[PDB]
C-alpha cells in the first residue's frame, strides 16, 4: 500500500573486499582489529596486497546502500519502493553494484564516470574482529549539480516520505545532503541520518552539526554515540543521557520532534524522544558468533526504515530493525572464486 520511491537514500556505493588476515597485516598498516576508517596514503598498498596475499571475497557494500536494500527487502511489496543515488566508475565493480542493486529491486540511479574507479571497502578480519578501510575513489565524485539537481533525478527525491543518508556521505557531499535535508524540512518529510562511525564526529563535525538541525531521526551505535558526546562536550558516557541531550539539539522543523536511536550490539537499543528514553532488548539471536556488528547495524536501520515508511509505531519500527538484524547476515566462505587458481 506504499508506492514506488517512497523511501529515498543516497551515499557511497562501495564493493566490500573481505578476507581473514593476520596481526602482521594489521600492524604493517597500523590498523586496529575492530574499526572503520577512510584510506590515507599509507594504505594504498593495503589493497593490492590484501587481494594478492589472502583469500578475499566480493560483496556489494556501502552503508546507506545496504540499508536501502534491506528496507526494500522488508517492504517487498512494490519493487522500487526504495531509491538510491551515488557515484560509481565505469568498470567491472561498477557493473556488479548495479546488478546487485537490480536484484534487490532497488530503483538505483548512479552517476557513472571514467576518471575514478568504483570505490571499495576492505574488511580485514581477524577472529571476530573487523577492521574496515574504505577507498571511496569514485563514490567521492558525487556532485549535486551534475546528478541530484537533474530533473529526472531530483524528481524521484520529491516522491519520498522518508529520506536516509548515512553520515559517511558527509565526507563526500555535504551540499547534496543539505539540499535533501532542507527539502524534507520545507515539505514536512522525514529526514534521517546515521552517525556512521567515530571519525564522522571527530573530523566532520562542521558538516554534521550543520546538518543536525534537519535530522528527524538520528541513528548510530554506542561507540559513535560516545564519540559524539565527547566531541559535542556532553560530559557523560551514559548512553541514555547521550540520547537525551542529542534529542534536544537545535531543530529546524518544529512539526517533528527529534528521535534518537542507538544500537548496542547485543545489549539494548536506546530510543530517546521528547517524552522519554526507552530501552529495547534484542532478539535472542544467540550462538550467532560470527556476526558482522557493522552489517548488523545497517540491517537494523533498513528494518526500521521499512516500517517507518508506512507510519507504523516506533516500537514496531524497532521490532523490524531487530528482525532484519538477525536475518540479513553476511558470511565468509560462502561464494566460490570466479576463476580457479590451480595452475
Ligand atoms: C559494514 C558496511 O559499512 C560500509 N562502510 C564502511 C565504511 I569505512 C564506509 C564509508 N566510508 N562509506 C560508506 N559505507 C561504508 C561497508 O562498505 C560495509 O558495507
Amino acid at each position: 500500500s506504499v508506492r514506488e520511491n517512497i523511501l529515498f537514500g543516497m551515499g557511497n556505493p562501495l564493493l566490500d573486499i573481505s578476507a581473514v588476515v593476520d596481526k602482521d597485516f594489521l600492524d604493517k598498516y597500523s590498523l586496529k582489529p575492530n574499526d572503520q576508517i577512510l584510506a590515507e596514503d599509507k594504505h594504498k598498498e593495503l589493497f593490492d596486497e590484501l587481494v594478492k596475499k589472502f583469500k578475499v571475497e566480493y560483496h556489494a557494500g556501502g552503508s546507506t546502500q545496504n540499508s536501502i536494500k534491506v528496507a526494500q527487502w522488508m517492504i517487498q511489496q512494490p519493487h522500487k519502493a526504495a531509491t538510491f543515488f551515488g557515484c560509481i566508475g565505469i568498470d567491472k565493480f561498477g557493473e556488479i553494484l548495479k546488478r546487485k542493486a537490480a536484484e534487490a529491486h532497488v530503483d538505483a540511479h548512479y552517476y557513472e564516470q571514467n576518471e575514478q574507479p568504483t570505490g571499495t571497502c576492505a574488511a580485514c578480519i581477524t577472529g571476530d574482529n573487523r577492521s574496515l578501510i574504505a577507498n571511496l575513489a569514485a563514490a567521492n565524485c558525487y556532485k549535486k549539480e551534475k546528478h541530484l539537481d537533474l530533473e529526472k533525478n531530483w524528481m524521484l527525491v520529491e516522491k519520498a516520505r522518508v529520506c536516509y543518508i548515512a553520515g559517511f556521505f558527509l565526507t563526500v557531499s555535504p551540499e547534496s545532503v543539505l539540499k535533501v535535508a532542507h527539502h524534507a524540512s520545507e515539505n514536512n518529510r522525514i529526514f534521517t541520518l546515521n552517525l556512521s562511525a567515530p571519525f564522522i564526529s571527530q573530523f566532520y563535525k562542521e558538516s554534521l552539526m550543520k546538518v543536525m538541525p534537519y535530522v528527524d531521526i538520528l541513528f548510530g551505535n554506542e561507540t559513535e554515540a560516545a564519540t559524539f558526546a565527547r566531541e559535542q562536550g556532553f560530559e557523560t558516557k551514559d548512553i541514555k543521557e547521550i540520547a537525551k541531550k542529542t534529542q534536544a539539539l537545535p531543530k529546524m522543523n518544529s512539526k517533528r520532534q527529534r528521535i534518537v536511536i542507538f544500537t548496542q550490539g547485543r545489549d539494548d537499543t536506546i530510543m530517546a524522544t521528547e517524552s522519554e528514553v526507552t530501552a529495547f532488548a534484542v532478539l535472542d539471536q544467540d550462538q550467532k558468533e560470527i556476526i558482522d556488528t557493522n552489517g548488523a547495524g545497517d540491517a537494523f536501520v533498513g528494518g526500521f526504515l521499512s516500517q517507518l515508511v508506512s507510519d507504523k509505531p516506533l516500537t514496531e519500527c524497532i521490532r523490524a530493525g531487530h528482525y532484519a538484524a538477525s536475518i540479513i547476515i553476511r558470511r565468509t566462505g560462502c561464494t566460490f572464486p570466479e576463476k580457479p587458481d590451480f595452475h
Side-chain angles (χ1 to χ4, degrees), residues 12 14 16 36-38 61-63 66 121 132-134 136 168 199 292 294-295 298 330:
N12 302 318
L14 305 188
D16 306 331
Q36 284 175 114
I37 81 180
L38 299 186
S63 163
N66 298 323
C121 195
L132 302 194
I133 315 88
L136 294 191
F168 278 132
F199 79 79
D292 195 3
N294 307 139
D298 283 352
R330 248 163 61 190

Side-chain angles (χ1 to χ4, degrees), residues 75-118:
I75 280 161
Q76 196 60 76
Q77 255 86 279
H79 285 339
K80 309 185 196 179
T83 291
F84 181 80
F85 294 167
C87 185
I88 47 157
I90 296 168
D91 60 2
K92 189 191 198 144
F93 297 179
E95 205 62 58
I96 299 181
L97 302 171
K98 301 158 74 184
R99 171 156 71 61
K100 298 263 114 218
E103 313 177 359
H105 302 302
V106 190
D107 190 0
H109 298 283
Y110 300 98
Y111 178 83
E112 325 194 47
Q113 45 60 256
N114 316 268
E115 296 66 21
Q116 289 272 60
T118 298

Side-chain angles (χ1 to χ4, degrees), residues 291-310:
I291 36 147
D292 195 3
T293 307
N294 307 139
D298 283 352
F300 181 72
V301 176
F304 186 110
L305 293 190
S306 66
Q307 305 308 311
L308 192 280
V309 93
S310 28

Side-chain angles (χ1 to χ4, degrees), residues 1-3 6-7 75 160-162 188-190 217 256 259 303-318 320:
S1 70
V2 292
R3 67 305 244 97
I6 187 190
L7 204 224
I75 280 161
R161 290 290 214 124
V162 190
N188 203 40
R189 270 71 151 68
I190 304 155
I217 299 202
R256 269 145 207 313
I259 310 189
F304 186 110
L305 293 190
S306 66
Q307 305 308 311
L308 192 280
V309 93
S310 28
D311 267 291
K312 292 320 174 257
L314 292 187
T315 287
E316 196 72 328
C317 287
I318 295 171

Side-chain angles (χ1 to χ4, degrees), residues 50 56 60 65 76 97 122 192 198 253 267 336:
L50 170 68
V56 74
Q65 218 184 179
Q76 196 60 76
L97 302 171
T192 74
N253 164 34
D267 294 308
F336 306 175

